[PDB]
Amino acid sequence: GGSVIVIDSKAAWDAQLAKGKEEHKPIVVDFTATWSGPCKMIAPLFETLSNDYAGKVIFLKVDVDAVAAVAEAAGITAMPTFHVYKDGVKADDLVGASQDKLKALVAKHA
């Protein structure tokens, strides 16, 4: 919900990366899995952050099992993994469900 945009395909991924270029907003992505306890724990915070930073940062969700080709291309091997994209390319990351480090990652780029 909120401002978290669910990515279902490479085409949708590419469209959102292009939108970030046009809007000059960083994109933060949660590469996540439904079966992962840490992922479930932090997904609500990812959503509230998406609302708090609406207008400054774009938030995407990629389920690594439903969009495996995108997650594989992005090198995801543990979940949650957060990436930041700027100008279409990877700029920063965080591996693991750390609420404090996720808040810090978003603030750094907003």
Curated annotation (Swiss-Prot):
Which residues bear the site annotation Contributes to redox potential value? 37-38
Site: Deprotonates C-terminal active site Cys. Where? 30
- Annotated Thioredoxin domain ranges read 1-110
Which is a Pfam family this sequence falls into? Thioredoxin
Q: List keywords of the entry alphabetically.
A: Cytoplasm, Disulfide bond, Electron transport, Redox-active center, Transport
Task: Locate the active site.
Answer: 36, 39
GO CC, sorted alphabetically, is: cytoplasm
The reply to whether DNA-binding figures as a keyword in the UniProt entry is: no
Disulfide links within the chain: 36-39
Q: Where in the cell is it found?
A: Cytoplasm
Reported function = Participates in various redox reactions through the reversible oxidation of the active center dithiol to a disulfide. The H form is known to activate a number of cytosolic enzymes.
The entry's family comment says: Belongs to the thioredoxin family. Plant H-type subfamily.
Protein name, entry field: Thioredoxin H-type
Q: Which species does the entry assign this protein to?
A: Chlamydomonas reinhardtii (Chlamydomonas smithii)
Q: Give the gene name.
A: TRXH
